[PDB]
A = this chain, B = another copy of it.
Amino acid sequence: SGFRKMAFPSGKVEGCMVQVTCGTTTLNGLWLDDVVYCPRHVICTSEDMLNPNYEDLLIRKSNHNFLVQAGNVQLRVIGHSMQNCVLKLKVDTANPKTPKYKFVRIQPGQTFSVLACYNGSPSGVYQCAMRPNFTIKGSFLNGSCGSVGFNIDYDCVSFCYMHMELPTGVHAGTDLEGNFYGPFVDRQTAQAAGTDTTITVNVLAWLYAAVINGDRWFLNRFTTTLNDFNLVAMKYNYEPLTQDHVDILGPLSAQTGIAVLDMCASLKELLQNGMNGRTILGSALLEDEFTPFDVVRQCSGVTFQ
């Protein structure tokens, strides 16, 4: 019993964090096999940030200008290249703590764990989600650039996120191939996020989690249709629900005996009437950063090693 915002165990990723220094800038890198990955703006000064020409700035950098420190392990840089918005530094030592891993570009709505690091040292871990406007609502301070987000399937780490804080206080970054999520660029120039809508399939998954845990007050006598529900979602800035989403919710439907469309009718009533000062799973608002997989994992206890 109980339902918590739960991150993956971070140990497999902690062994990969290093500090990367170029001139006077220091941020975090990801050391996997004999390559170190970090944001390319490590080569910039605060002044370079307004309109950086990264190809031109890289001309004046050689291997020995990049200092990489793994704790106190000093790493020798033997090559460097730029791939989209990440720098890839070839070092002469394979990381002996490299886990089984893959790089994945996640879709909006998907969740992941963040290991926030500073000066190459992990400081905390938390859960968040790729928002529909391709920002994340993280917790990051200066020096956190190069911190990574990931999921873990048994023994394999799936890295999905690595760059900046917008003036609005939300966060933008890349996949591990260096392509930004959404339209953001690594330049200090006007960029605004776009509508932050609610991840409907995740809210439904969390209502199923609530039923499994005994929070049942929101179940009602009604049902609805996909098209009728989606009219309501549009009014409340909820993402449309698709048949694919209904199928993904099938296992939770089968565990609880509540058809997806009946749960949609409960969500519809919650969106139109509010929670009336009540709570669900300890929350006074509808939570949208648990995926269906998140709910099954935490309500079934799958494990990783």
Which residues of A line the B interface, CB within 8 A? 1-12, 14-15, 71, 115-119, 121-128, 137-144, 165, 169-171, 213-214, 274, 277, 279, 282-285, 297-305
Contacts and interface: CB of A to CB of B under 8 A. Distances in A.
Nearest to A305: B121
A45 to B, nearest CB: 22
Within the oligomer, what is the number of copies of this chain? 2
A28 B1 CA distance: 18
6 contacts: A4-B128, A6-B125, A7-B7, A118-B303, A137-B282, A283-B284
By CB atoms of chain B within 10 A, which of A9, A115, A284, A305 has the most?
Answer: A9
A140 B144 CA distance: 32
A165 to B, nearest CB: 6
Contacts of A214: 169
Contacts of A170: 1-2
The 5 closest A-B pairs by CB, nearest first: A11-B11, A284-B284, A1-B169, A6-B124, A4-B139
Contacts of A279: 285
Nearest to A2: B139
A15 B305 CA distance: 11
A7 B122 contact: no
A5 B214 CA distance: 24
Contact of A169 (B115, B213, B305): B213
A161 to B, nearest CB: 14
Contacts of A139: 1-4, 6, 298
